[PDB]
């Protein structure tokens, strides 16, 4: 069939959090309190568009 | 009674038998065609029901 179209390393290039899981769990509740709008937008687009390549932004 | 009664009774019997003959030939053709390509009421083989499919959002987003 057709060739699968997936983004490149430049499109996937973002500097990440180099943060341990214990640190994330310590900051977890306030992260879910303050950063909830962007997180909910990303989760909404993830369950709306099942393709992960449509939610890189 | 007379010969015309037997004559017309024979006509009615022949009409009924000829109609039964053509109906049996047509139902043979109908059954053969419908079994060959099931698109009418008969020979409708089953298929799993869509009503037992979960459509709620799930844990994995890629569904």
mmCIF file of N, CA, C and O in Angstrom, chain A residues 7 10 17 19 23-24 32 34 36 38 42 46 53-54 56:
data_model
loop_
_atom_site.group_PDB
_atom_site.id
_atom_site.type_symbol
_atom_site.label_atom_id
_atom_site.label_comp_id
_atom_site.label_asym_id
_atom_site.label_seq_id
_atom_site.Cartn_x
_atom_site.Cartn_y
_atom_site.Cartn_z
ATOM 1 N N UNK A 7 7.058 12.057 10.967
ATOM 2 C CA UNK A 7 7.956 13.219 11.018
ATOM 3 C C UNK A 7 9.407 12.818 11.239
ATOM 4 O O UNK A 7 9.738 11.674 11.556
ATOM 5 N N UNK A 10 14.264 16.433 13.194
ATOM 6 C CA UNK A 10 14.165 17.872 13.419
ATOM 7 C C UNK A 10 12.789 18.254 13.947
ATOM 8 O O UNK A 10 12.671 19.124 14.819
ATOM 9 N N UNK A 17 12.513 17.289 29.700
ATOM 10 C CA UNK A 17 12.788 17.351 31.127
ATOM 11 C C UNK A 17 13.721 16.199 31.493
ATOM 12 O O UNK A 17 13.429 15.027 31.229
ATOM 13 N N UNK A 19 14.352 14.939 34.372
ATOM 14 C CA UNK A 19 13.794 14.974 35.715
ATOM 15 C C UNK A 19 13.457 13.551 36.134
ATOM 16 O O UNK A 19 12.823 12.810 35.374
ATOM 17 N N UNK A 23 11.172 13.041 41.553
ATOM 18 C CA UNK A 23 10.978 14.486 41.484
ATOM 19 C C UNK A 23 9.630 14.806 40.854
ATOM 20 O O UNK A 23 8.900 15.696 41.314
ATOM 21 N N UNK A 24 9.282 14.079 39.787
ATOM 22 C CA UNK A 24 7.998 14.278 39.121
ATOM 23 C C UNK A 24 6.835 13.941 40.043
ATOM 24 O O UNK A 24 5.811 14.629 40.036
ATOM 25 N N UNK A 32 -0.207 19.027 38.027
ATOM 26 C CA UNK A 32 -1.569 18.839 37.571
ATOM 27 C C UNK A 32 -2.503 19.974 37.924
ATOM 28 O O UNK A 32 -3.583 20.071 37.332
ATOM 29 N N UNK A 34 -1.353 23.424 37.986
ATOM 30 C CA UNK A 34 -0.969 24.609 37.229
ATOM 31 C C UNK A 34 -0.935 24.368 35.726
ATOM 32 O O UNK A 34 -1.420 25.204 34.956
ATOM 33 N N UNK A 36 -2.495 22.243 33.812
ATOM 34 C CA UNK A 36 -3.581 21.354 33.429
ATOM 35 C C UNK A 36 -4.197 21.678 32.075
ATOM 36 O O UNK A 36 -4.724 20.770 31.429
ATOM 37 N N UNK A 38 -2.807 22.883 29.115
ATOM 38 C CA UNK A 38 -2.039 22.317 28.010
ATOM 39 C C UNK A 38 -2.075 20.794 28.036
ATOM 40 O O UNK A 38 -2.171 20.147 26.984
ATOM 41 N N UNK A 42 -3.607 18.406 25.095
ATOM 42 C CA UNK A 42 -2.850 17.318 24.484
ATOM 43 C C UNK A 42 -3.578 15.986 24.621
ATOM 44 O O UNK A 42 -3.619 15.194 23.675
ATOM 45 N N UNK A 46 -5.122 13.670 21.697
ATOM 46 C CA UNK A 46 -4.654 12.291 21.603
ATOM 47 C C UNK A 46 -5.820 11.316 21.475
ATOM 48 O O UNK A 46 -5.787 10.410 20.634
ATOM 49 N N UNK A 53 1.204 11.627 15.461
ATOM 50 C CA UNK A 53 1.901 12.643 14.683
ATOM 51 C C UNK A 53 1.105 13.934 14.535
ATOM 52 O O UNK A 53 1.664 14.932 14.068
ATOM 53 N N UNK A 54 -0.170 13.943 14.910
ATOM 54 C CA UNK A 54 -0.984 15.148 14.848
ATOM 55 C C UNK A 54 -0.960 15.951 16.141
ATOM 56 O O UNK A 54 -1.632 16.985 16.221
ATOM 57 N N UNK A 56 2.185 16.606 17.941
ATOM 58 C CA UNK A 56 3.561 16.935 18.297
ATOM 59 C C UNK A 56 3.672 18.357 18.828
ATOM 60 O O UNK A 56 4.444 18.618 19.758
#
